[PDB]
């Protein structure tokens, strides 16, 4: 996260870390939506162009963390994966359209003051909150600059941008399964997600019922916090039917 701050303890209890066993390294961010399911971005697991195709056994999921590099004994939990499901129409060839994946954990995790799931949005909530100008929050242990990594979880709040503006900021083909967010060059404020943040959550707080909903997944951007550029996120509500389906099928 670029131009964001350190998170408070228990601020994002649904934040998950995809950790690689060999080398032992932070791979991406992810979110806890159940006691057995984690949601991430499909490109963190499968990205053929760079020869990336991770399987269950190569990953570890670490929940309840604050510090990036320390094993927070008695606070975080480390789970192994049972299965990984990538969206059948994930488009890695052209624009990362439907960049979503679900990971089933070997055993359920127990919630605590640091481990608690996020809510997935419903048509009404998506409708009322996904409007340009409205701010959301992104979190992660990703780079602090385009061109190092923070010691604890970082957070930044960004406004959603009008689709026209998003499309006119890049050459890539934007689909209805993505939305972009960030401040405009004539806004003063800055902020953006960056490498290492991919896979994590873009969430909003409902003013109707006080709950936090995950509206997007960090998907891509060109550079980090560049002016005239925005971060793109997978539109979780449009892919919800797929989510429901694998979760009530497996």
């Amino acid at each position: 996260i670029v131009e964001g701050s350190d998170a408070e303890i228990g601020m994002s209890p649904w934040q998950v870390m995809l950790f690689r066993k060999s080398p032992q390294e932070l791979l991406c961010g992810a979110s806890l939506i159940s006691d057995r399911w984690v949601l991430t971005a499909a490109h963190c697991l499968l990205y053929p162009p760079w020869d990336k195709n991770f399987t269950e056994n190569d990953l570890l999921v670490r929940i309840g963390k604050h510090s990036r590099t320390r094993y927070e004994r008695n606070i975080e939990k480390i789970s192994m994966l049972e299965k990984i499901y990538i969206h059948p129409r994930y488009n890695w060839r052209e624009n990362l359209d439907r960049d979503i994946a679900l990971m089933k954990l070997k055993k359920p995790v127990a919630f605590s003051d640091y481990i608690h799931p996020v809510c997935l949005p419903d048509r009404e909530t998506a409708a009322s909150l996904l409007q340009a100008g409205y701010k959301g929050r992104v979190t992660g242990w990703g780079n602090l600059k385009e061109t190092g990594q923070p010691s604890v979880l970082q957070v930044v709040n960004l406004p959603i941008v009008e689709r026209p503006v998003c499309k006119d900021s890049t050459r890539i083909r934007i689909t209805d399964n993505m939305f972009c967010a960030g401040y405009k060059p004539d806004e003063g404020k800055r902020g953006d997600a960056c490498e290492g943040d991919s896979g994590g959550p873009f969430v909003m707080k409902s003013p109707f019922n006080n709950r936090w909903y995950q509206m997007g997944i960090v998907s891509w951007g060109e550079g980090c916090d560049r002016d005239g550029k925005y971060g793109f996120y997978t539109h979780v509500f449009r892919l919800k039917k797929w989510i429901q389906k694998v979760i009530d099928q497996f």
Binding site: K21, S22, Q24, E25, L60, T69, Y71, I78
Partner: peptide
């Protein structure tokens, strides 16, 4: 720079 985790989690 990641501190090691319990061997038990690699398996």
């Amino acid at each position: 720079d990641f501190e090691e985790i319990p061997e038990e989690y690699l398996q």
